[PDB]
Design a protein around this ligand. Structure first.
Ligand SMILES: Nc1ccn([C@H]2C[C@H](O)[C@@H](COP(=O)(O)O)O2)c(=O)n1
Ligand SMILES: Nc1ccn([C@H]2C[C@H](O)[C@@H](COP(=O)(O)O)O2)c(=O)n1
Lengths: 316, 316
């Protein structure tokens, strides 16, 4: 079945992975260097052995395609994937007047009544961002995030390059170019960056009338991170090919540090006992073309029957 | 034997590769997405089925490590790997007064007496660069080349970042970092770059006391390019590990567009009839540590017995 490569990656780390202490401090099992490919002509690589929220995947993707970096857009789409980063700056800043929302990321998970306090302050910040234009502009803009990297790279001479935009035109005029690259790694920002991009860089390739994309991910959370990632980039591969009028080829996922957090072992072993179901089908609005103008109703995921979801603690 | 992966890549392209027209215009057979690893603890991955000039590999590598971008250094090391690029600017410029060295890259290979004229003008330029300080500074500096990318990345606010330098310190203090990346791809230079970097970006990894490096190469000439590349980066992996006091792990080569030029088919098939010999051994000067201060006598390649060299036309 289409998702097998992922299952084999999980098995692999679990069997051949060596223990490696980590940044967050909850040790991992890791392998360095891995590559797996999915033939997008067979279906959409959205995991069926575990429920994955596609809606969160696309709203976040459209956010990137708009070159948007403001959390407000996601919020009106009920996506809260990036709230924490915005909250971080806000809480550790002048205006924040309230409880000790310091180190909230761990203390919340721990157990205290603090969870309510945190979740409340967050709920608060979230409403401000969504209605207070000055606040949104001040605390909701994350700045250097995938949207600005892909669509507004900062030139040395104070300007803006739309990488992804330029790359799409290239695929249209010079489909056989070996230079169709989009990079998110900027040497000058990473030294003091919150979380340097995990999806470091990707490359397009055209031949036989099919489009393929290869992503280089410096670091990956096999359990929590990879599933979303495979889908997000498989979606991109479809969108661009829809714009360029090409057929979809494969999606190739190359890893640097592929890893499984020790406290995800039971959960991953739960997944491994399940057997894949037929891959779901994706269909884009046949009318619309300029993917930048794409809207959520323009993307559909036909018949997806996944096993229930599996819960597991986040590590940051 | 250690070099088998390369042989399997060549077989693979030759058997499974699809034809793809190319930039230079001498069609290729290509595959998209490939990864191969070499266990550096077994020997040095310098091809034995075909003679590869190691001396050219290291003089070019030391040139990179010095953050040097001037052709003069290589010339005093009898390395002429980058002369063409320097000649290009020089010939198509004010001062050049002489024959029609225009489009020299093809006309030279073709057959005319021109080869002598070209080779003479080149021989001329080469002597100027090596002795005329004003000329060297004007026409010998290539500018944006691996040396400046690795060791003097240009900040937006007009400054210089020594990526590789910083990364080595990181490996020394935070060996388990998943952010040990060195990128050569700058979105603002590639639009109007002669030849955007093929060795796009690499990543370091440490665990078990061994250092590993993974290189992402957007485009590769299996026949002429890959052999050198594998060695150059295997050398780097040894040097850095010598500085950091780590044991050597593997070298992982990830490709984007792995390709074989149609006019290299016979030659590659020559190689494929040979059987690998034991991998050579590399040993660095045990005294010296700051690799930046490394000199050629500080690197040695013990017992390398390759089959003769194979000749093949260059395509640019
Ligand atoms: N889109 C993302 C973002 C993060 N991570 C993971 C990678 C690491 O597990 C951790 C980030 O830590 P580090 O900077 O050390 O890689 O989160 C991931 O798998 N996918
Ligand atoms: N160090 C290098 C430099 C170049 N090439 C090859 C890659 C392509 O075959 C051609 C450059 O063309 P392009 O820009 O289209 O990739 O030269 C290579 O294999 N290794």
């Amino acid at each position: 079945m289409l998702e097998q490569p992922y299952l084999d990656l999980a098995k692999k780390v679990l069997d051949e992975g060596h223990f490696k202490p980590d940044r967050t401090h909850t040790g991992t099992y890791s392998i360095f260097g891995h590559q797996m490919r999915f033939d997008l002509s067979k279906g959409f690589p959205l995991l069926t052995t575990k429920k994955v929220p596609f809606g969160l995947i696309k709203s976040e993707l459209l956010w990137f395609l708009h070159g948007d970096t403001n959390i407000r857009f996601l919020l009106q789409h009920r996506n809260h994937i990036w709230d924490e980063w915005a909250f971080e700056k806000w809480v550790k800043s002048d205006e924040y007047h309230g409880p000790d929302m310091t180190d909230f990321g761990h203390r919340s998970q721990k157990d205290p009544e603090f969870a309510a306090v945190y979740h409340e302050e967050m709920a608060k910040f979230d409403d401000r961002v969504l209605h207070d234009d000055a606040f949104a502009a001040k605390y909701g803009d994350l700045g250097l995030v995938y949207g600005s990297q892909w669509r507004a790279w900062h030139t040395s001479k104070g300007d803006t390059i739309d990488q992804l935009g330029d790359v799409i035109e290239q695929i249209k005029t010079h489909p056989y170019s070996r230079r169709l690259i989009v990079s998110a790694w900027n040497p000058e920002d990473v030294p003091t960056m919150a979380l340097p991009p995990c999806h470091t860089l990707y490359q397009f390739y055209v031949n036989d009338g099919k489009l393929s994309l290869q992503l280089y991910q410096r670091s990956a959370d096999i359990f929590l991170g990879v599933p979303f990632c495979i889908a997000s980039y498989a979606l991109l591969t479809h969108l661009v090919a829809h714009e360029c009028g090409l057929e979809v080829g494969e999606f190739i996922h190359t890893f640097g540090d592929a890893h499984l957090y020790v406290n995800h072992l039971d959960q991953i072993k739960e997944q491994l006992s399940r057997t894949p179901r037929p891959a779901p089908t994706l269909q884009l609005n046949p009318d619309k073309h300029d993917i930048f103008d794409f809207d959520m109703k323009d993307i559909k995921l036909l018949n997806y029957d996944p096993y229930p979801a599996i819960k597991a603690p986040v590590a940051v």
